[PDB]
Symmetry: D3
Subunit: 303 residues, 6 copies
């Protein structure tokens, strides 16, 4: 039967998922030795079990990654029946290619190899930076989108003739998809050369959208440029709240009226102390995905 | 010793490359048995050689792919020193994911595995449909761009205040890159919408194209339907002349007729895929060779020189 | 739950098999994109199912093979419980070695690796050109023989003191096996020689065939040239009637004309490969179904019953 | 540069090969611990070297196999540049399929996997029982034929109108190939039901040929049946002298005028004491193959 | 229910004892030799979808017994076995587990692990591996069961006089210490070559020599002599694996060892079976319980006590 | 000639010392972090066809330093490096090398070996592996160099008074015995928890505590106290790997240890660097020579003496 475990990356999210599945997070001791080496022991019988591990590979990335892979190795050596890595936010996803044959690692592929090597049978994740990461594995990878929940929220805002806009050139595809869903509305595009805005945003509510928010620098400069060109209100929507570096002060001194993110990464206390940062939960979506996977039901029929 | 072999996919491109490397193509019998099974025999000693196979996996895709993987296997079992697959056009590249967990293959990855399995040590290709395909392999994958050569030709046209245009949302990154290099001009974008069955597909133009030559640029042209509708929409919004540039001339289905009946002043493509007879009969379709780029890339690989320097 | 899917290689055989298993073929869209790339989508839930794909890798070989491996990949990524490739005719089986270290591929092994790589859990096939192909895989490979069905039909002819004949040296083991089962009759062998350019190929007959019906038996017929010359030689040595039996009707090249112009009284083949229109027009070519054998083999695999019992 | 080593299977053959290559067998201690476990130590620097190991997997098969695989593992872990297994007689070659889905191992494939696993880069062997064994490896496999040397011998016999004959049904292909080479002469075929002889052998010299001779039982019964049907002289030719079981007494009480075999397996003293058993050496052929492999010269051009 | 047991010729008696404790007949695998000495294996029963356990130590003759095991696995895998567990009470080649000073030798324990993984072993069950780290030479689960509880139970029934537990060499000190703790927290002695020097008060006491295995018996016999030279009362030698190679029979027969007590992971030769001072314990209870737990997906942790 | 050295942030000073002894500049790998803490690696020089050595212990912070190493290897492999040798003086996670009593834990040493093999390491060079058998966790060559000759040379220059070599616990007895033999065939003492009990005559003698590594220092400090309680003269503690986690600085600062002598496979914190009773030896000579030999295809066996 089904068993859930969680590491130390997203335990609050993990509990929410467990509650919606009417079950609990099983007993695994996930900690550290004195020297900082990860320590894992599975304190339950998992023989022949259908195991799900809930763990984003978010900050601290390499520790949380190592927690996940050694949990998998422990479970596999303990004769787990099936092991699914539920990785709401998949870290290193941005390292997915070698532009101009630059001598960089393709770290997303490396992580996929690592997970495959320790015996992951399946991956469940939310809004991969690049969908092609599905092809970095042999095993099934289910990449569920956060947009159904983000959209539902955008709809409850009563936007005066909203235009959707991608903060940079690499997010245009995602912005367009959101524009389609938001009553087939217009899209603008920001092109840095100074930030040139391609599209008519004067007198309109603007929905800035991306897959993730990191330092918030580009997002903040974009929101400024939008209002410098006559935008009314500016909302920032993303799935993954990375919020590294000086993100909290960037958003606090920004022009953005509200920031809406999902809960694939926990928020720091500084970010929780901001009045205009709101959280939406994917616990319902992930719980349902988990249920369907456990019960051999179609996942296709949930997008 | 460097040795070049070609299959039947791109033999004229292969020949050009060999010419530019001041060499000749090696003796390999690449054909068919009576029943359509691929027949390969390498008719020279390749032991310890630095071998490059020049084969796009273009139409007919499955025969050309099989010729490739089978050539690799024969070379490997005959103790080739190193095997580089030069695949100017990498077929199946569009099958690179499972959107909404649709029960579809990721064939681009399957092809990568197949090449890896028979012992390809390196891949050289031009303008992969998705760069992430580099990550579908363990081995080095160099993904060169045709855009420098396309650009060289764009400059030779002397355009009236040209604007670069991406025919769809996926080509935007490339369009900008070219806008920058094309005398730091500006860019426009095609936003295709068709939300309802009773409403016609509209091709929205994000940007101002009125009274300006338009350079439509993309990685490939397949049936040309999007491209022709993009062209039409540009003219209706007041664009002067419309030029279409792309690397891969796939031109399947009704492409020749679509172009013939289009408002496109000229279509300029690279030679990663040989042109059909239907396409060769069009007056306004012109071809640029990447045999220069690929010869140098190959030269650098064999001499252990930096490939980064090529971008 | 057991589920059967078919590609476009052997859809009528697939249908027969489904009928005999009292089921229907699953919903899978197996086609092409405009450019000739294989397009597959599995249009039902296969999660945890016991899946069998029915596809010979017959002509066009490379398209049919690619359909197969791509179907497997889509099923695997969609969490099929188990995937069995039912490949009645296994193409590329003749490319199974490198004679004299000739610089050729061992494509039969390459195909095996490809199937393994995409996650085939088992292979079911009929009369592999070489049984050793079983060893080209890790997974279980069941190699069933068509000869029981061919034999059933041979017995229905009532022959005048029949002698079983292997059309070449490779079919001798099978010919004997059949000689034994065909009322423990005797056997003869065709020893083809052509040592010199100025001498005609002679087809030596080892054994006495005078005043006897001859049953030419083989695993396959391709162009039929050997078979027709074998037939002619038998008659010239005094054989009465000549019947030709084989499992795989490949019939490439000029096979139809070769048979039409032959002295062969009747040619009887199994349905592992669909017949060409050219062949269907011949009065003396007849077809036997293995859909009974393959349905039972599949039934046994899914119920975990002994396959050994099937020989 | 090139280095040769040998195990304890075919050291005399190995020395002959080494002599013809104007080199020597390098220092490897190949022996046993007290309990019978194989003991290997390579007593030379092999770093970056082009290594050839000479070792048939003949009786005792599993010991000689283990000697070979652990020699390879020792050499690989010691950073050998390239490792070629020269395996004149490839044992377990007869276990190459599962007839009627019999629940037997395909041991030939298993051995190939084992050799591949320890890091063999290439295999050189003589007259594989089944040529398809080339396809059991990823790596190059060169299967040289003994027939050029066997034929050269047959030619020096002045055979009165020789007929070539395969002792059983499974050797017909090989007999025919020999018949072609022996001035395109006739072939007969033995069919056990009593042994039926298909072909006219009355008043003719008979050349019984196979890839190997094991107990000699079938070979002896065949030679008898040939003379019972009026054959003049009967010669037995094979590449691999296995000579297991009661082979020596079988041949001694047989009708065979002479037995001619190659040196891919050493002869027992009982077999050496027979007046009508002669040996031909493949040391020249194997040395030449080794030389060509070492020098990146065509092997194709030696068949 | 879907469980089936098979066995090769390495440990037939042990295999039968295990089978008896699981109330299960041994499967029909015709494991023999062709005339030339090549292994012959045929499985004469349906194993499709089964949970299959093969009982075969890789003891002398090592290479033959290893090959039986691996070809048995291959035949079973190609015959569509559901799961395959290699039960290898004594794991041969375990001592070849490293390259000391980068000596040009094989890591044959790893080579064997690779071989077993390659032919499709899904898990390994084994007793007192020479090195525990051999668990890491596999990807698959490896259960390394200890003989110590059985050996300890026997020790406790001897009614020894103030026993001292002692290692035959410096290499066995860790185990000896552990068995000393378990044996009513008694004392430990240590044997160190310097002649053999005994570190500890052995005078007047029953001594218990302990090790994972006994090979030729040479060191063990000297150890026993030295102990009695220092006034030891009785000397017992407890070990798991009775390798007994070379001159072991004479060594034990001429020793001052009161009793050698070994487990049944390697069959005894007739000669050593005759020795009055050599006694065997069976692990068939332990191994049968482990198999039953693996079969029914119960905890293996509970096997250690 | 085709040799190039790179290094991450784990052991920069050691890497530089190795580089200096090979008269070779360290290659330009920009090894850093993005804003979020993800490893950032770019190789800013041609490495095509090169013989590449990466110098990176997987010491604290372990997971960051391991990830630097593996992504460095991947970047180099995809950039067409000819050969890649991971030089990992201290190999982290080496203690997680087994599953005792089938405990549901990872064999993380093996997981790391797999990871390194997967990204394309062609060989590993390392110093005093916690378990030698970790050599068998790889398919590729693994050279496990010993610190002992450097540590022994230092010991011999102290001009000790009738030194006795001693293990801090039962687990280090084998090494202690080996170093006793090398140290002019001197005596050995053993420390056994029973309070700590010293087995041996330490009275009036300089004692040399020896181990492969020092972590918190707790056991080492008690060991030193017990030795002096039994009349030891001076107590030195020699080890290879200075892990020094937890409260190591206070433990050493408050010890009765005259000198702690460690090798430079893990950099020292500023606090421990300040301690007057803590001294480092360098292995850069040894590792540089090993690399030079690997590079020129010379015997490594000669490195052990
Ligand atoms: Cl480069
Ligand atoms: Cl069966
Ligand atoms: Cl457990
Ligand atoms: Cl060396």
């Amino acid at each position: 039967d089904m068993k859930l475990f969680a590491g130390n990356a997203t335990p609050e999210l993990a509990q929410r998922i467990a509650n919606r599945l009417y079950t609990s997070l099983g007993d695994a001791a996930v900690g550290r030795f004195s020297d900082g080496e990860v320590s894992v022991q599975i304190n339950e019988n998992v023989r022949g079990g259908d195991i799900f591990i809930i763990q984003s590979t978010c900050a601290p990335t390499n520790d949380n990654l190592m927690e996940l892979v050694v949990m998998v190795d422990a479970l596999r050596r303990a004769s787990a029946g099936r092991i699914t890595a539920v990785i709401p936010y998949f870290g290193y996803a941005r390292q997915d290619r070698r532009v101009r044959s630059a001598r960089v690692p393709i770290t997303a592929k490396v992580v996929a190899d690592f997970l495959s090597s320790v015996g992951v049978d399946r991956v469940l994740t939310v809004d991969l930076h690049a969908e092609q990461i599905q092809g970095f594995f042999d095993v099934p990878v289910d990449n569920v989108f956060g947009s159904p929940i983000l959209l539902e929220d955008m709809l409850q805002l009563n936007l005066d003739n909203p235009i959707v806009v991608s903060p940079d050139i690499g997010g245009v595809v995602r912005a367009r998809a959101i524009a389609k869903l938001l009553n087939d509305t217009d899209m603008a595009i920001i092109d840095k050369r100074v930030m040139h805005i391609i599209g008519d945003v004067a007198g309109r509510d603007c929905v800035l959208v991306d897959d993730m928010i990191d330092t918030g620098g580009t997002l903040c400069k974009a929101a400024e440029a939008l209002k410098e060109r006559g935008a009314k209100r500016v909302f920032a929507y993303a799935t993954h709240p990375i919020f590294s570096g000086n993100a909290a002060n960037n958003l606090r001194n920004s022009v953005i009226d509200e920031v809406v993110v999902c809960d694939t990464i926990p928020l720091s206390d500084e970010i929780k102390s901001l009045p205009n940062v709101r959280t939406l939960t994917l616990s319902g979506m992930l719980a349902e995905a988990i249920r369907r996977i456990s019960n051999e039901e179609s996942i296709s029929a949930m997008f």
